[PDB]
Amino acid sequence: ADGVGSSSGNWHCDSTWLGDRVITTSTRTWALPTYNNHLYKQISNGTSGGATNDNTYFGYSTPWGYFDFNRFHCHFSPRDWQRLINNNWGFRPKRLSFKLFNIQVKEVTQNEGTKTIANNLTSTIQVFTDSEYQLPYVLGSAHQGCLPPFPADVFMIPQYGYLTLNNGSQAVGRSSFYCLEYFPSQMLRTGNNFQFTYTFEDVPFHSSYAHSQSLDRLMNPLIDQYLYYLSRTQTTGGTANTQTLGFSQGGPNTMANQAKNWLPGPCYRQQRVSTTTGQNNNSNFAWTAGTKYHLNGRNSLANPGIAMATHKDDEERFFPSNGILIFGKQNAARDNADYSDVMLTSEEEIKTTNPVATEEYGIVADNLQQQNTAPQIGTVNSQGALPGMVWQNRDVYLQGPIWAKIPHTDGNFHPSPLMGGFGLKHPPPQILIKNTPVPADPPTTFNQSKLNSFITQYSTGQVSVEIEWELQKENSKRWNPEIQYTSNYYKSTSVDFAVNTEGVYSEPRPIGTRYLTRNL
């Protein structure tokens, strides 16, 4: 049975590689504190305080907390991530299991200056999953508070909150309030455990590979085309130079002129920034020159935006202003961190199919030329979908997110999340957890006011998550060797992806998925 003196689960951290499948399992130790002193609170921000209109909000913070494993380093060790990206053309999630076990509730009393902590054996926690998607879904915004990448670390559970419609700092009639105690929930004492299972819906494999061809090079280099293009509008001669028409076939020496079947993907142009700072304009342009969208009178940066190549050839010092993912190095500051404290990703691989984020999409015609008027052209800085476009998605990273919830709407176009990962109409459900309030002694004459005098408590336990992943094997006939992700050979003060002398785990660099190649 389950009692005070027996454990309700075991520690599972493992990975198993079987054929076309890999199964990861992770266990961590968590600590859960009481939030808001058991209260729900209205929160808002408005111009009155001095915020700009672009930052206003209205919402609620709750006493509850939630579990989040939406980063890949929750499930994969760095060596496992190497096995995946060097050997496979793609992967996708299939199913998951979740367990919550070995739960301990503790009470802390304050007397004079000294603080003491004891067990409370009869207290509970409450847990439920939102399986019908009835709550605002705050997973998928890339918040802090996921399970730690390193299995020995103990993490704090984050507080749940949400936003609803606002006008300035005020609410409107359509604004919704939610009470989370209004769902069914399971209550657990120190001997109880909790578990559920979930199945992923069909989703396309993430493409982990780069193309070894480019979209404008798909032709046979040895042969002419049978089609023709207009090669000459004027006679080339001694003196006159009158109007003429002349035509040529496309061939090996004019590839720019040949007829083609396909177009590069869409473009929304970003401003370019150099990591060599003396090359930048001297001014503070991050917001005023930023790439933005405009919704209901608010301006919001398109960050990272649609997938575009970070730079062209030999340009690596440049990046789009708001167009890339940027991670932190360990102990990086929250505000105004220096360039040496952060890690910049590069989407450079998709340069074959996708326009570079800092250039125009192309050129079109402005006017109607004639004998009287010379022709004029114009530059295309944003281009939506054209028939014949092909494109790649943004890459995924070991530090980065896995899935997002597709918003429930009448229509969408190519619902792949812009921060990267798998779009899901029915994502893995969110998991809510709370300490049950325990009153301090009531008065001995009746009073109708709600009791707000409590014994301070927190809880701890273990959590397990297990995901099964499907693999897509690499079939290539390429003769020469591939690029692989590898560790450095040379000696160093510390080992990458390990602890230091102080005990702190760190991740030296971001690692994407695209190493193997494939024909376009």
Epitope: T34, N37, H38, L39, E107, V108, T109, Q110, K115, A440, D441, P442, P443, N447, S449, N452, S453, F454, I455, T456
Partner: nanobody
Amino acid sequence: VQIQESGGGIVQAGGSLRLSCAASGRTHGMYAMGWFRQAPGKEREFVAVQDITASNTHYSSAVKGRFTLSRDNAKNTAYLQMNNLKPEDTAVYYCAAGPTLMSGSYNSARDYDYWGQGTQVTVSS
């Protein structure tokens, strides 16, 4: 939701001084009412706190055995009576209020929403 100090003054050592505090509105607020003090050039220190029903009460170690905290819900006020005063009790006392009383966290300033202007109490020997 204004808290307001009263009863400030200067006293010789051993005298009995009485600080008072009042609020306006939200009797569904002001659940917990208490006192802090900040001496010259020093950190703010929690002095006392009591809840609405008078069931739960706490005094600071230095404060205990000399001060008593009392409360009148009708007037929506709270009083602090002070006995056997020592000149290290010169400080600026703040009435403080909050929606909740916790057993671990009550002595932290993080748990109080509202703060008065303060009072100056001087104690001489």
